[PDB]
Scaffold this active site. Structure first.
Site, PDB file in Angstrom:
ATOM      1  N   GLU A 282       0.819  -1.214   0.000  1.00 43.86           N
ATOM      2  CA  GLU A 282       0.000   0.000   0.000  1.00 43.86           C
ATOM      3  C   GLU A 282       0.854   1.265   0.000  1.00 43.86           C
ATOM      4  OE1 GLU A 282      -1.946  -1.488   3.385  1.00 43.86           O
ATOM      5  OE2 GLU A 282      -3.950  -1.480   2.489  1.00 43.86           O
TER       6      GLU A 282
ATOM      7  N   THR B 165       0.057   1.908  -8.316  1.00 46.95           N
ATOM      8  CA  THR B 165      -0.464   3.181  -8.802  1.00 46.95           C
ATOM      9  C   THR B 165       0.508   3.833  -9.781  1.00 46.95           C
ATOM     10  OG1 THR B 165      -1.699   3.498  -6.744  1.00 46.95           O
ATOM     11  CG2 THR B 165      -1.314   5.441  -8.113  1.00 46.95           C
TER      12      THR B 165
ATOM     13  N   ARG C 297      -8.060   0.319  -4.847  1.00 44.54           N
ATOM     14  CA  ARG C 297      -7.108  -0.554  -4.173  1.00 44.54           C
ATOM     15  C   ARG C 297      -7.346  -1.995  -4.610  1.00 44.54           C
ATOM     16  NH1 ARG C 297      -2.243  -2.097  -2.589  1.00 44.54           N
ATOM     17  NH2 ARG C 297      -2.382  -3.817  -1.079  1.00 44.54           N
TER      18      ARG C 297
ATOM     19  N   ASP D 298       6.084  -4.586 -11.640  1.00 40.02           N
ATOM     20  CA  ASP D 298       5.821  -4.640 -10.209  1.00 40.02           C
ATOM     21  C   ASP D 298       5.593  -6.087  -9.804  1.00 40.02           C
ATOM     22  OD1 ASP D 298       5.263  -4.030  -7.565  1.00 40.02           O
ATOM     23  OD2 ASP D 298       3.170  -3.501  -7.965  1.00 40.02           O
TER      24      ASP D 298
ATOM     25  N   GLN E 102       2.102 -10.886  -1.207  1.00 39.97           N
ATOM     26  CA  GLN E 102       2.016 -10.325   0.129  1.00 39.97           C
ATOM     27  C   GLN E 102       3.418 -10.130   0.705  1.00 39.97           C
ATOM     28  OE1 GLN E 102      -0.676 -12.737   2.431  1.00 39.97           O
ATOM     29  NE2 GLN E 102      -2.492 -12.050   1.300  1.00 39.97           N
TER      30      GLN E 102
HETATM   31  N1  LIG Z   1      -3.992  10.201  -1.737  1.00 41.14           N
HETATM   32  C1  LIG Z   1      -3.032   9.422  -2.294  1.00 41.14           C
HETATM   33  N2  LIG Z   1      -3.239   8.082  -2.357  1.00 41.14           N
HETATM   34  C2  LIG Z   1      -2.313   7.260  -2.904  1.00 41.14           C
HETATM   35  C3  LIG Z   1      -1.073   7.844  -3.432  1.00 41.14           C
HETATM   36  N3  LIG Z   1      -0.341   6.821  -3.910  1.00 41.14           N
HETATM   37  C4  LIG Z   1      -1.049   5.680  -3.705  1.00 41.14           C
HETATM   38  N4  LIG Z   1      -2.224   5.945  -3.107  1.00 41.14           N
HETATM   39  C5  LIG Z   1      -3.259   4.955  -2.724  1.00 41.14           C
HETATM   40  O1  LIG Z   1      -2.673   3.756  -2.212  1.00 41.14           O
HETATM   41  C6  LIG Z   1      -3.517   2.653  -2.546  1.00 41.14           C
HETATM   42  C7  LIG Z   1      -2.702   1.390  -2.791  1.00 41.14           C
HETATM   43  O2  LIG Z   1      -1.539   1.681  -3.561  1.00 41.14           O
HETATM   44  P1  LIG Z   1      -0.829   0.490  -4.377  1.00 41.14           P
HETATM   45  O3  LIG Z   1      -0.514   0.926  -5.788  1.00 41.14           O
HETATM   46  O4  LIG Z   1      -1.694  -0.749  -4.384  1.00 41.14           O
HETATM   47  O5  LIG Z   1       0.532   0.241  -3.558  1.00 41.14           O
HETATM   48  P2  LIG Z   1       1.222  -1.213  -3.562  1.00 41.14           P
HETATM   49  O6  LIG Z   1       0.507  -2.110  -2.578  1.00 41.14           O
HETATM   50  O7  LIG Z   1       2.670  -1.078  -3.156  1.00 41.14           O
HETATM   51  O8  LIG Z   1       1.128  -1.812  -4.946  1.00 41.14           O
HETATM   52  C8  LIG Z   1      -4.301   3.057  -3.783  1.00 41.14           C
HETATM   53  O9  LIG Z   1      -5.691   2.787  -3.579  1.00 41.14           O
HETATM   54  C9  LIG Z   1      -4.077   4.547  -3.936  1.00 41.14           C
HETATM   55  O10 LIG Z   1      -5.326   5.240  -3.931  1.00 41.14           O
HETATM   56  C10 LIG Z   1      -0.920   9.314  -3.327  1.00 41.14           C
HETATM   57  O11 LIG Z   1       0.105   9.887  -3.754  1.00 41.14           O
HETATM   58  N5  LIG Z   1      -1.916  10.011  -2.762  1.00 41.14           N
HETATM   59 MG   LIG Z   2       0.153  -3.746  -5.516  1.00 42.90          MG
END
Ligand SMILES: Nc1nc2c(ncn2[C@@H]2O[C@H](COP(=O)(O)OP(=O)(O)O)[C@@H](O)[C@H]2O)c(=O)[nH]1
Ligand SMILES: [Mg+2]
Lengths: 372, 57, 339
Positions: free
Chosen positions: A42, A47, A179, A201, A205
């Site tokens: 997260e 993103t 998400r 990417d 988990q």
């Molecule tokens: N407000 C805001 N939300 C973000 C930003 N970057 C990511 N998110 C939120 O973080 C959530 C999960 O991000 P994700 O891409 O799944 O991160 P990952 O788990 O490392 O792949 C998404 O639903 C985005 O809305 C940001 O710069 N600003």
């Molecule tokens: Mg992810």
């Protein structure tokens, strides 16, 4: 039997076909800038890839894709409303409803959680909207750092009327906030100014041993993403380790990995919009979770954006320098770290940040081929 | 959690009821196998170049 | 208290197995093989150098005919070689370029490969119309595919980073049997000669003997200090050797249910990447991170030779069924045939 000899010569020209094909495949591989994305869960990895597809790619958006993107958003809306309400009684101290006559709505949302195939009926959108406008439910959302809540909760809750409709077509800002847990691999290929890129990417988990880290010992660069607004939250696995502390521990293990002794890291300090929002509030102060931030002095080489509050400049540079403290503790000049302030859901922020990393990525690639 | 502790207990019970032989014979059978097949091992006993497929011209 | 009550009975059973293994340990393999004449200086030469891959090579697998071998590289390619003539027969493009393992069916009709995509892709080498492309993808693993080996043209065993192994019916795509005992990622597996059992090495520093039909973990062997990266059966099927990051190779026997011998040198610190016996099982060849291979004497625990021709990490090696040659794959994008 000189078809014996014929098949020997047939074996040779089939080989010749492959050698000329491989030579074309050699130059498609040598011009490609392989970029790996790392970071805690997260933090914003998936993103960032969505931004590359928004800016440079024309993929496919058939019927199965629209129904998959709409259903995912509705799943995020449901988890957001069912998590906030289910935590009201479990917080210390607990939070009560502002209007007790909404109790039949709380009773409904809890009975419909963990159902296998939720039809998403009309009454759901009405209860979740009438509950989200409760001042007591808003009070429990402001304490969402005491439990696990997705970042896109407020964004999707403020637009229940938009999502509930039958002809709802999600905007691309909706897809950036959505998400989704990534499984396996999540790649994209694109070309900017005749220079092709390849971002990927790794899904799954929380992995502590990272055996698959050997597969990226030759990538052009690593983009490490940090949820710097998560300084007051815990990770999901143990509910006891700080999100920002685990990001520091993960960065130290990546920076000192024996298979990445020569790979440089482009550091994305993501979620700058929420860090400003969280610091300016004053409810959660960084020194309460990192006491050394009280002693911290804003650097003079700092470059504040126009209209930026001094409180926000010191906070975001402290998180920046907690990672540079790791990158400068070793390296021998075999690889470097280049920090950046990013907002992954800000499409214009990602384009301008990605254009500043071009010349760095291009000669990282040129030194790996001994050309520089 | 609790169900994982029980499956390990019976798994360890299965591996304890195994009948084992002594190493003195296990090492002997292992050794008596290599000598009986060393004569047809090309890497151990090199065959002439008239037989090696990676040397013939 | 039943939870903690089961925890200390688990400690008892481990202590019971420890005494039972020491009871039958009446001697060492070194003592019995201390008088045997050594194998002498074994010097193999590079007979072939295969130059087709555009990036690091992760896996290879000799065919049953001891002539054709398939290699896997992260350039998105899966090349099939004619070792005798150095000619390339096929150059299969892959969906995902992050390959980790590749298999060659004993019939020679299909090949398999997989990696970070968590799927095992089957490629029919006998397609009737077009080029050699994917025919089947075996999905279901929640972890990276580390190793896979065919049993028939319709059955294949896999191992993945989700700490589990599985047996597949290739056409239906169902898991005939799972194998669930490991704590760490399963890195390698080896099929027994009779195809009734198979061993698997994982990142819990332990190997397991599985029953192919029931899915039972009959026996577990420990002794290693770090993750196990390689595994291979002894030619008779009653023993197997392992490789691990602690820069060591061990030899376990199934009937004795313990470790027989350790292969190591104080001058060796880098981990093991691949292992394979010779045809008679007298030699134990292993690939390392220090760019070279070591031909060990399986009976005396002393190094007999070194295969030193590569310029990067030796990632995989294998010996032919006729025991005539040894192939090595390395990150320097080359495959070298040795004998
Ligand atoms: N407000 C805001 N939300 C973000 C930003 N970057 C990511 N998110 C939120 O973080 C959530 C999960 O991000 P994700 O891409 O799944 O991160 P990952 O788990 O490392 O792949 C998404 O639903 C985005 O809305 C940001 O710069 N600003
Ligand atoms: Mg992810």
């Amino acid at each position: 039997t000189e078809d014996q000899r014929n098949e020997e010569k047939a074996q040779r020209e089939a080989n010749k076909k492959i050698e000329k094909q491989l030579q074309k495949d050699k130059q498609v591989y040598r011009a490609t800038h392989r970029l790996l994305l790392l970071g805690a869960g997260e933090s914003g990895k998936s993103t960032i890839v969505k931004q590359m597809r928004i800016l440079h790619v024309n993929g496919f958006n058939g019927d199965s894709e629209k129904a998959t993107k709409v259903q995912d958003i509705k799943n995020n809306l449901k988890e957001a409303i069912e998590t906030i309400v289910a935590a009201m009684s479990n917080l210390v101290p607990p939070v009560e409803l502002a209007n007790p006559e909404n109790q039949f709505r709380v009773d409904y949302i809890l009975s419909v959680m963990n159902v296998p195939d939720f039809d998403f009926p009309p009454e759901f959108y009405e209860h979740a909207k009438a509950l989200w406008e409760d001042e007591g439910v808003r009070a429990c959302y402001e304490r969402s750092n005491e439990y696990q809540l997705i970042d896109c909760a407020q964004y999707f809750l403020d637009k229940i009327d938009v999502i509930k409709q039958a002809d709802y077509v999600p905007s691309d800002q909706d897809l950036l906030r959505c998400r989704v847990l990534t499984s396996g691999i999540f790649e994209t290929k694109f070309q900017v100014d005749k220079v092709n890129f390849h971002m990927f990417d790794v899904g799954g988990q929380r992995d502590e041993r990272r055996k698959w880290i050997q597969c990226f010992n030759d990538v052009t660069a690593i983009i490490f993403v940090v949820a710097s607004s998560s300084y007051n939250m815990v990770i999901r696995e143990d509910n006891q380790t700080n999100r920002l502390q685990e990001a520091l521990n993960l960065f130290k293990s990546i920076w000192n990995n024996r298979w990445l002794r020569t790979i440089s890291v482009i550091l994305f300090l993501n979620k700058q919009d929420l860090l400003a929002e969280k610091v300016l509030a004053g409810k959660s102060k960084i020194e309460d979770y990192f006491p050394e931030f009280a002693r911290y002095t804003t650097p003079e080489d700092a470059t504040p954006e126009p209209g930026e509050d001094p409180r926000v400049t010191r906070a975001k540079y402290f998180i920046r320098d907690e990672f540079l403290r790791i990158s400068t503790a070793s390296g021998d000049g075999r690889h470097y770290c280049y920090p950046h302030f990013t907002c992954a859901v800000d499409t214009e922020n990602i384009r301008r940040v990605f254009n500043d990393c071009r010349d760095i990525i291009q000669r990282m690639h040129l030194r790996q081929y001994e050309l520089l | 959690s609790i169900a994982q502790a029980r499956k390990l207990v019976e798994q360890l019970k299965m591996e304890a009821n195994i009948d084992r032989i002594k190493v003195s014979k296990a090492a002997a059978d292992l050794m008596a196998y290599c000598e009986a097949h060393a004569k047809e091992d090309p890497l151990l006993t090199p065959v002439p170049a008239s037989e090696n497929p990676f040397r013939e011209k | 208290s039943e939870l903690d009550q089961l925890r200390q009975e688990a400690e008892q059973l481990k202590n019971q197995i420890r005494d039972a293994r020491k009871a039958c340990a009446d001697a060492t393999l070194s003592q019995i093989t201390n008088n045997i004449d050594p194998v002498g200086r074994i010097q193999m030469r590079t007979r072939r150098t295969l130059r087709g891959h555009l990036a690091k090579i992760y896996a290879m697998h000799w065919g049953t005919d001891s002539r054709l071998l398939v290699s896997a590289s992260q350039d998105g390619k899966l090349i099939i070689w004619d070792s005798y003539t150095t000619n390339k027969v096929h150059a299969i493009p892959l969906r995902s370029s992050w390959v980790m393992t590749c298999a060659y069916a004993p019939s020679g009709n299909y090949v398999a490969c997989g990696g970070l995509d968590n799927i095992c892709s089957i490629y029919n080498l006998k397609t009737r119309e077009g080029n050699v492309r994917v025919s089947r993808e075996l999905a279901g693993h929640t972890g990276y595919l580390s190793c896979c080996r065919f049993l028939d043209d319709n059955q294949i065993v896999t191992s993945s980073g989700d700490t589990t192994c599985a047996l597949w019916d290739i056409e239906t795509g169902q898991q005939t049997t799972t194998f669930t005992g490991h704590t760490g990622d399963v890195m390698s597996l080896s099929l027994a000669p009779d195809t009734r059992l198979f061993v698997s090495g994982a990142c819990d520093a332990s190997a397991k003997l599985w029953d192919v039909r029931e899915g039972m973990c009959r026996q577990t062997f420990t002794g290693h200090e770090s993750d196990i990266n390689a595994i291979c059966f002894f030619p008779n099927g009653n023993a197997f050797a392992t490789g691990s990051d602690d820069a060591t190779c061990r030899l376990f026997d199934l009937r004795a249910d313990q470790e027989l011998m350790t292969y190591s040198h104080d001058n060796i610190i880098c981990g093991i990447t691949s292992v394979s016996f010779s045809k008679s099982g007298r030699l134990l060849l292993a690939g390392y991170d220090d760019f070279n291979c070591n031909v060990w004497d399986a009976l005396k625990a002393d190094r007999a030779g070194v295969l030193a021709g590569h310029d990067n990490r030796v990632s995989c090696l294998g010996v032919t069924d006729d025991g005539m040659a040894v192939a090595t794959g390395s990150w320097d994008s080359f495959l070298k045939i040795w004998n």
